[PDB]
Amino acid sequence: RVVPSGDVVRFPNLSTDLIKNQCVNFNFNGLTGTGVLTPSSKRFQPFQQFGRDVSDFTDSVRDPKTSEILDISPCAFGGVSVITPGTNASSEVAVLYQDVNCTDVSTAIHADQLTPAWRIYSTGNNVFQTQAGCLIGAEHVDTSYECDIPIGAGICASYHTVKSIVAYTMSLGADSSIAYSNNTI
């Protein structure tokens, strides 16, 4: 998850300013929680004050202070999978940050608001964005092979000699071709 750094408390005419695009611990008027703030475009009415999901979750807000439409989002979360070529092969790993924006993970890692973190860890300048999520610790070659370690969306990970951990698009097989005729057999 991502540590909520920031607090926005507002009331109509104590009050604080408007943080956007940061996981903050907001407190609107009778509206609490954490999340990331951003402006909205939802067509309110003069008596609307805050919207909801079709589930039991408020998703948008109207400012008590300045009467502006903002939609709220949950902060950031997801799971972590660990990639390894085997302790017998090597000793370096790579991680997948499952279903999360690589624009934001790169932001939060330099500010170091990621839980859990580690002692000895760095980026390595190999941030690739998969459809399955954020890959850190592998270089993107453009060749094709069989799928050793699948991650998703046809992308598989492997450990070739270049030796390092590589990510690529799968080889479906050899593109054979054979003729057709009406005499040949």
Next chain:
Amino acid sequence: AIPTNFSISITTEVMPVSMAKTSVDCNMYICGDSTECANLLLQYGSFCTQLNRALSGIAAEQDRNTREVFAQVKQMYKTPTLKYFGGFNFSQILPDPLKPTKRSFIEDLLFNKVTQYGECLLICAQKFNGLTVLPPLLTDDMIAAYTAALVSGTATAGWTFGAGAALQIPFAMQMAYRFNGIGVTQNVLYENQKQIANQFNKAISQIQESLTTTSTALGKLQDVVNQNAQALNTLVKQLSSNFGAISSVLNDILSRLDPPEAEVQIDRLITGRLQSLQTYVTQQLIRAAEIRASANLAATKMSECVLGQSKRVDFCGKGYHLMSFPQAAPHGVVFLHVTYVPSQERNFTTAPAICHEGKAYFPREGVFVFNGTSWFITQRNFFSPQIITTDNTFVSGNCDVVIGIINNTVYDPLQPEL
């Protein structure tokens, strides 16, 4: 009763192969930005470990299912240029290189007739309840690539196409063996070639115009998406269950009343959701067992109907099986059972036995009927009267043993040598 003529039908079959994989976070489901939720969670074991790996384990076996269906060939055969072989017009079945979408026109129907939770689309987004759908491994064009490769290689070899490395054979000759497989002489194909090709290419368009307008033949697929969305909606509905506590709002109980009061109230609430999450897991788990059992049937049909002629009746659809064809679809496949169906029956009078000079002459194969003038031999699949010689009829034992013997003669080619 013997049929004289026939028809050729293309019977359809839709079988689902794969369930949409899910995952659920604990803390973004049961806690909701509550530190004391996690502080109370530590007295409930590391349940999130097996709750993750159960759904991940069945997520992995979904991709086990798909490659158990498709990943069988070793050579990606290229789409041939000509799409019209011996009067048989396959052009709407292969994907179009002229308008590259890597789908057939038939498949483009299927990606339309089938037409909350976290999901990524290329922008990812996640909702509040810590649950999402992981995307499948094999993307659809990749699946459509295996789809196009097998049907292409189907029309060129067949058996060595199923026995590993394929071969080349003329497509009409491979048709005639399938007639020879069900006991039809190969001339019958050769002497009815335009009529069959008419009956083939009309029946595709008759099928093509059938499923185009209306629907619910595909109902075996959309229910799958309809059932588990209800299962997802079931879990989301359960958030308003108060379980005998104050309310389903943790923050009120955090704000109104004392923590020694609250930590039996939210404790009553946490055990409500945690028990509720187990029920979702178990029904999700047992359902994955059923579709995987259905997938093993589908993978069996892929190798026993497409890569070879079968013989078991009412398998591969009704009628005498001739040739099968796969079609890709979301979470499933569609088979095309090109089958043989005879027609035009008549009445004829039998002859089990033939009395000629006190001996019993029984046919090597076929039976004997009186057409009205004399006696003839034919096969059971098709009315082809032929001449009665020793070439198709052995002798064993004398006459006057069995029931129903006929006084008639046997032609022998020894006679005109005199």
Next chain:
Amino acid sequence: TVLPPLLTDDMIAAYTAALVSGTATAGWTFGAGAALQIPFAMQMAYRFNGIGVTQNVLYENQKQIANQFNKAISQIQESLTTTSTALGKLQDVVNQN
């Protein structure tokens, strides 16, 4: 409570009696398509060269076969007459629920 099924046993017997009656007339296109008509012995003879026996063995030994046919049926009939000892599977499903 128990809901009643959609079909009665008599309706199930209606399919059962029809197919058994329809077994003795066509056989293969009986289910593959439209029905046909064949004498029963000729239909029996296809089973022999189906498994690799010439049709004389039927046509010679027809009395012995038919007497092996009907008499073993009555032996099956008296097998499921005295004591059950066989239909425990249908007793199991009633015992389960």
Next chain:
Amino acid sequence: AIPTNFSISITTEVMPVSMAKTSVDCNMYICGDSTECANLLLQYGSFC
């Protein structure tokens, strides 16, 4: 070895098909003519 005579067996097989379908009412099971049973299950969704 080549057989000469034969025998025509009649082998049976018995397969189950249909489990007896059931149904059940909640208030005739959990409540039993009570009111506050039905009046307090409102915090439990629609389980029935």
Next chain:
Amino acid sequence: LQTYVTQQLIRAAEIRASANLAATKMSECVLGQSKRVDFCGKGYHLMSF
């Protein structure tokens, strides 16, 4: 009641696999001469009922 329904549900799906075998044994075993071994009973199958 909840654990009844799930435990009712498993044996529901259990016999449905058994009914599929019956659906196989209704068509393939009766409507035509099968050739596969020890299916349709023991011995060389001729006729089913």
